[PDB]
């Protein structure tokens, strides 16, 4: 049922972003034939798991999942345990753990806490992977929020010249609540998706992690600015459009003076 | 073989469909209904089973309806519900049937429910219309008179919306004010709610509300109606002002608190330095 | 802020201008010899020619790479350490916030003003950045009046000459009666 799949996805866009897990489950039970397409297509909140081997909290993706079991990036083990041995190389384990260390310092500086997990899988042309970042607001603090971001990267390594093609896709989902006595209980949700393509120089001085790292933070900065300025601005404009504090009668006085000016400007030509 | 023998029951389909329909965003109601219709694939079950979801949405939103032969519109609300899908128009002193799917009024009949509160309602309705015209560019209001547990109450509902699906946004304002007159005092209960959806190349949704509590000294009809409107004016002005303050506040506090624009050092991360520095700083800071 | 950033960079090069009077010379150096590079990382990496500047007393200082590295602050505010958008981001964002119908006309009609746009090759760098940030297949026409500095004043002279201006301003008597309200009511 292709028409039901379109209707299911179009509905989820309009439904509240906090009720996506419960609302998605209901649509899956109605049309269970398109369960795989709905789960894959629809953006879901990031689930967290505790690795008892290393003693570290890691974020769960679709890439690390081998059947039912999820691989922990710090331990490089599948929970529940498997004997499939799907690890593409030993060099990948060194690059993946080093990458996690790079973005572990990153999140501590920008976000200050939360969890970050980097999953790398090798490909014939060049390695790909996903970088999951999740930051939750303090429970005791009046301010409530939830940061979710998914950075999918595919690196196409060139034979000669050392100028790999970096393809980045970034999906951010933001929850906000302000419990100020003046306003009451304000809830402002949003979700944005963007893509970027560059051709950075790879070397010992300029490694893959350095080239990817700059592209990841650059996309987050553009999304942070655009959301706060463009989307949150437009939202404020509509609220002020609905009701006015100043009387229209007083506004029409200033409009009549402005209109008279415009006529006097077009007049004097 | 994916087990297709556990199909959702007709009662469960109605419960799910009714939830999706009743929570549809302002200006996207029909779009939600059409999607739900295809998902259930049972027109008889949805039409008969979700009838209360159409009534609930139209009343929750204060859906204004045009009555043939009258200049203004009347708001569809729970306070006007006379049964048999008919609502009271207290200004025009008639009842009418309302089609919740088509949003059409028909068969207007004389109906007078105000009783001894006619003078109280007329003073409040006139003062409110002047207020709505001054503060709402396309605002509508309906004022009902009720006796609640023996108490005299005037109920003022105000609705205003802006729907521009061609511009990828819809917004609705709602305000409900119940003024219960118990001489020498009156209880003021207000609920203000705003919802805005902007979905050009993304999805951002605002849902905000505030409960308002106040009290007044009861006088005559003319002075009591004027004081009620001024209480509404002050409370709605503070509410809109606080939302404007929250936009500036979120940028500086909550929004930056989740993700800083820069680290506490006010510098961009030097990825080449971090790879070598991480090892140096772990031993130098120990 | 660019003049302050240039002074900081010249001190690293080894030319001190501690006095407030000497800072005016740093501004004069910027105004006389300062160009905005079309590619910043190219000119940053490449070894720059030591371009000499003659100070009021007669002493010669080598300005060198500081010419093009100083003005970059307008497009990269992190250089000074300010959490703000670049000048090229401000222009595009301001247009994108406007309604869909006007966005194409606002991109078509872009007017440069202010003294800080007078940098050599400013228009070339800005026009490149606007096209990258702006949507695909949009016409970007940036017009610069020769008298950028005088644009604000000349407009004021035109408005003041109009008879409608007599109704627009607030008289002394009106101010005394209403107070601060009179300016807020009549100000646009």
mmCIF file of N, CA, C and O in Angstrom, chain A residues 24-66:
data_model
loop_
_atom_site.group_PDB
_atom_site.id
_atom_site.type_symbol
_atom_site.label_atom_id
_atom_site.label_comp_id
_atom_site.label_asym_id
_atom_site.label_seq_id
_atom_site.Cartn_x
_atom_site.Cartn_y
_atom_site.Cartn_z
ATOM 1 N N UNK A 24 3.787 6.333 15.776
ATOM 2 C CA UNK A 24 4.406 5.450 14.744
ATOM 3 C C UNK A 24 3.941 4.005 14.963
ATOM 4 O O UNK A 24 3.633 3.335 13.958
ATOM 5 N N UNK A 25 3.896 3.548 16.220
ATOM 6 C CA UNK A 25 3.475 2.179 16.630
ATOM 7 C C UNK A 25 2.042 1.900 16.154
ATOM 8 O O UNK A 25 1.787 0.775 15.681
ATOM 9 N N UNK A 26 1.153 2.893 16.273
ATOM 10 C CA UNK A 26 -0.286 2.803 15.899
ATOM 11 C C UNK A 26 -0.415 2.649 14.376
ATOM 12 O O UNK A 26 -1.211 1.795 13.944
ATOM 13 N N UNK A 27 0.343 3.438 13.603
ATOM 14 C CA UNK A 27 0.351 3.413 12.109
ATOM 15 C C UNK A 27 0.890 2.061 11.617
ATOM 16 O O UNK A 27 0.356 1.553 10.608
ATOM 17 N N UNK A 28 1.912 1.519 12.287
ATOM 18 C CA UNK A 28 2.539 0.194 11.986
ATOM 19 C C UNK A 28 1.506 -0.925 12.203
ATOM 20 O O UNK A 28 1.440 -1.829 11.348
ATOM 21 N N UNK A 29 0.727 -0.866 13.293
ATOM 22 C CA UNK A 29 -0.326 -1.866 13.629
ATOM 23 C C UNK A 29 -1.467 -1.814 12.600
ATOM 24 O O UNK A 29 -2.027 -2.893 12.310
ATOM 25 N N UNK A 30 -1.806 -0.628 12.077
ATOM 26 C CA UNK A 30 -2.844 -0.445 11.021
ATOM 27 C C UNK A 30 -2.341 -1.033 9.696
ATOM 28 O O UNK A 30 -3.100 -1.799 9.068
ATOM 29 N N UNK A 31 -1.112 -0.680 9.299
ATOM 30 C CA UNK A 31 -0.451 -1.116 8.031
ATOM 31 C C UNK A 31 0.874 -1.794 8.391
ATOM 32 O O UNK A 31 1.939 -1.200 8.241
ATOM 33 N N UNK A 32 0.852 -3.056 8.890
ATOM 34 C CA UNK A 32 2.081 -3.765 9.262
ATOM 35 C C UNK A 32 2.954 -4.210 8.076
ATOM 36 O O UNK A 32 4.096 -4.567 8.312
ATOM 37 N N UNK A 33 2.410 -4.188 6.855
ATOM 38 C CA UNK A 33 3.104 -4.584 5.598
ATOM 39 C C UNK A 33 4.235 -3.597 5.277
ATOM 40 O O UNK A 33 5.246 -4.040 4.695
ATOM 41 N N UNK A 34 4.069 -2.321 5.651
ATOM 42 C CA UNK A 34 5.032 -1.212 5.384
ATOM 43 C C UNK A 34 5.802 -0.854 6.668
ATOM 44 O O UNK A 34 6.299 0.288 6.753
ATOM 45 N N UNK A 35 5.932 -1.792 7.616
ATOM 46 C CA UNK A 35 6.569 -1.579 8.948
ATOM 47 C C UNK A 35 8.041 -1.180 8.776
ATOM 48 O O UNK A 35 8.476 -0.240 9.473
ATOM 49 N N UNK A 36 8.769 -1.873 7.892
ATOM 50 C CA UNK A 36 10.215 -1.665 7.621
ATOM 51 C C UNK A 36 10.451 -0.289 6.988
ATOM 52 O O UNK A 36 11.437 0.374 7.366
ATOM 53 N N UNK A 37 9.576 0.116 6.057
ATOM 54 C CA UNK A 37 9.650 1.408 5.320
ATOM 55 C C UNK A 37 9.346 2.571 6.277
ATOM 56 O O UNK A 37 10.045 3.601 6.185
ATOM 57 N N UNK A 38 8.342 2.409 7.149
ATOM 58 C CA UNK A 38 7.906 3.433 8.141
ATOM 59 C C UNK A 38 9.004 3.650 9.191
ATOM 60 O O UNK A 38 9.306 4.824 9.481
ATOM 61 N N UNK A 39 9.569 2.563 9.734
ATOM 62 C CA UNK A 39 10.650 2.581 10.764
ATOM 63 C C UNK A 39 11.917 3.242 10.199
ATOM 64 O O UNK A 39 12.534 4.044 10.928
ATOM 65 N N UNK A 40 12.284 2.910 8.956
ATOM 66 C CA UNK A 40 13.495 3.416 8.251
ATOM 67 C C UNK A 40 13.319 4.892 7.868
ATOM 68 O O UNK A 40 14.249 5.681 8.133
ATOM 69 N N UNK A 41 12.176 5.240 7.268
ATOM 70 C CA UNK A 41 11.877 6.578 6.685
ATOM 71 C C UNK A 41 11.658 7.617 7.794
ATOM 72 O O UNK A 41 12.290 8.689 7.726
ATOM 73 N N UNK A 42 10.790 7.306 8.767
ATOM 74 C CA UNK A 42 10.383 8.232 9.870
ATOM 75 C C UNK A 42 11.553 8.367 10.852
ATOM 76 O O UNK A 42 12.072 7.323 11.297
ATOM 77 N N UNK A 43 11.944 9.605 11.171
ATOM 78 C CA UNK A 43 13.008 9.929 12.161
ATOM 79 C C UNK A 43 12.473 9.630 13.571
ATOM 80 O O UNK A 43 11.385 10.146 13.909
ATOM 81 N N UNK A 44 13.204 8.821 14.344
ATOM 82 C CA UNK A 44 12.826 8.370 15.714
ATOM 83 C C UNK A 44 13.821 8.924 16.734
ATOM 84 O O UNK A 44 14.994 9.108 16.410
ATOM 85 N N UNK A 45 13.389 9.221 17.986
ATOM 86 C CA UNK A 45 14.311 9.600 19.059
ATOM 87 C C UNK A 45 15.405 8.543 19.273
ATOM 88 O O UNK A 45 15.126 7.366 19.117
ATOM 89 N N UNK A 46 16.610 8.989 19.638
ATOM 90 C CA UNK A 46 17.814 8.126 19.779
ATOM 91 C C UNK A 46 17.748 7.369 21.109
ATOM 92 O O UNK A 46 17.649 8.032 22.163
ATOM 93 N N UNK A 47 17.791 6.032 21.050
ATOM 94 C CA UNK A 47 17.799 5.126 22.232
ATOM 95 C C UNK A 47 19.235 5.016 22.756
ATOM 96 O O UNK A 47 20.163 4.950 21.920
ATOM 97 N N UNK A 48 19.400 4.986 24.083
ATOM 98 C CA UNK A 48 20.721 4.871 24.779
ATOM 99 C C UNK A 48 20.818 3.492 25.445
ATOM 100 O O UNK A 48 19.789 3.004 25.960
ATOM 101 N N UNK A 49 22.014 2.893 25.407
ATOM 102 C CA UNK A 49 22.354 1.581 26.014
ATOM 103 C C UNK A 49 23.641 1.723 26.836
ATOM 104 O O UNK A 49 24.509 2.527 26.441
ATOM 105 N N UNK A 50 23.751 0.958 27.929
ATOM 106 C CA UNK A 50 24.930 0.948 28.840
ATOM 107 C C UNK A 50 25.779 -0.295 28.506
ATOM 108 O O UNK A 50 25.239 -1.417 28.601
ATOM 109 N N UNK A 51 27.040 -0.092 28.114
ATOM 110 C CA UNK A 51 28.021 -1.178 27.833
ATOM 111 C C UNK A 51 28.726 -1.524 29.150
ATOM 112 O O UNK A 51 29.442 -0.649 29.679
ATOM 113 N N UNK A 52 28.528 -2.749 29.648
ATOM 114 C CA UNK A 52 29.024 -3.215 30.974
ATOM 115 C C UNK A 52 30.482 -3.685 30.862
ATOM 116 O O UNK A 52 31.111 -3.882 31.923
ATOM 117 N N UNK A 53 30.997 -3.857 29.638
ATOM 118 C CA UNK A 53 32.389 -4.325 29.357
ATOM 119 C C UNK A 53 33.353 -3.162 29.618
ATOM 120 O O UNK A 53 34.251 -3.315 30.472
ATOM 121 N N UNK A 54 33.157 -2.044 28.909
ATOM 122 C CA UNK A 54 33.975 -0.795 29.036
ATOM 123 C C UNK A 54 33.408 0.080 30.167
ATOM 124 O O UNK A 54 34.209 0.796 30.803
ATOM 125 N N UNK A 55 32.091 0.022 30.404
ATOM 126 C CA UNK A 55 31.387 0.850 31.405
ATOM 127 C C UNK A 55 31.089 2.239 30.868
ATOM 128 O O UNK A 55 31.331 3.219 31.602
ATOM 129 N N UNK A 56 30.579 2.312 29.632
ATOM 130 C CA UNK A 56 30.317 3.564 28.872
ATOM 131 C C UNK A 56 28.922 3.482 28.237
ATOM 132 O O UNK A 56 28.554 2.387 27.771
ATOM 133 N N UNK A 57 28.198 4.605 28.215
ATOM 134 C CA UNK A 57 26.856 4.733 27.588
ATOM 135 C C UNK A 57 27.049 5.114 26.115
ATOM 136 O O UNK A 57 27.690 6.154 25.865
ATOM 137 N N UNK A 58 26.528 4.299 25.188
ATOM 138 C CA UNK A 58 26.660 4.469 23.714
ATOM 139 C C UNK A 58 25.262 4.567 23.087
ATOM 140 O O UNK A 58 24.326 3.916 23.589
ATOM 141 N N UNK A 59 25.140 5.367 22.021
ATOM 142 C CA UNK A 59 23.872 5.604 21.272
ATOM 143 C C UNK A 59 23.699 4.518 20.205
ATOM 144 O O UNK A 59 24.706 4.158 19.558
ATOM 145 N N UNK A 60 22.466 4.036 20.025
ATOM 146 C CA UNK A 60 22.121 2.906 19.120
ATOM 147 C C UNK A 60 21.721 3.456 17.745
ATOM 148 O O UNK A 60 20.838 4.340 17.700
ATOM 149 N N UNK A 61 22.354 2.953 16.680
ATOM 150 C CA UNK A 61 22.064 3.270 15.254
ATOM 151 C C UNK A 61 21.555 2.013 14.539
ATOM 152 O O UNK A 61 21.400 0.971 15.209
ATOM 153 N N UNK A 62 21.284 2.120 13.234
ATOM 154 C CA UNK A 62 20.829 1.003 12.358
ATOM 155 C C UNK A 62 22.045 0.231 11.823
ATOM 156 O O UNK A 62 21.878 -0.961 11.497
ATOM 157 N N UNK A 63 23.210 0.881 11.732
ATOM 158 C CA UNK A 63 24.458 0.327 11.137
ATOM 159 C C UNK A 63 25.072 -0.727 12.071
ATOM 160 O O UNK A 63 25.508 -1.778 11.560
ATOM 161 N N UNK A 64 25.108 -0.455 13.380
ATOM 162 C CA UNK A 64 25.760 -1.325 14.399
ATOM 163 C C UNK A 64 24.894 -2.568 14.655
ATOM 164 O O UNK A 64 25.451 -3.573 15.144
ATOM 165 N N UNK A 65 23.592 -2.498 14.347
ATOM 166 C CA UNK A 65 22.606 -3.595 14.555
ATOM 167 C C UNK A 65 22.875 -4.723 13.553
ATOM 168 O O UNK A 65 22.676 -4.492 12.340
ATOM 169 N N UNK A 66 23.322 -5.887 14.043
ATOM 170 C CA UNK A 66 23.465 -7.142 13.254
ATOM 171 C C UNK A 66 22.369 -8.118 13.695
ATOM 172 O O UNK A 66 22.549 -8.786 14.735
#
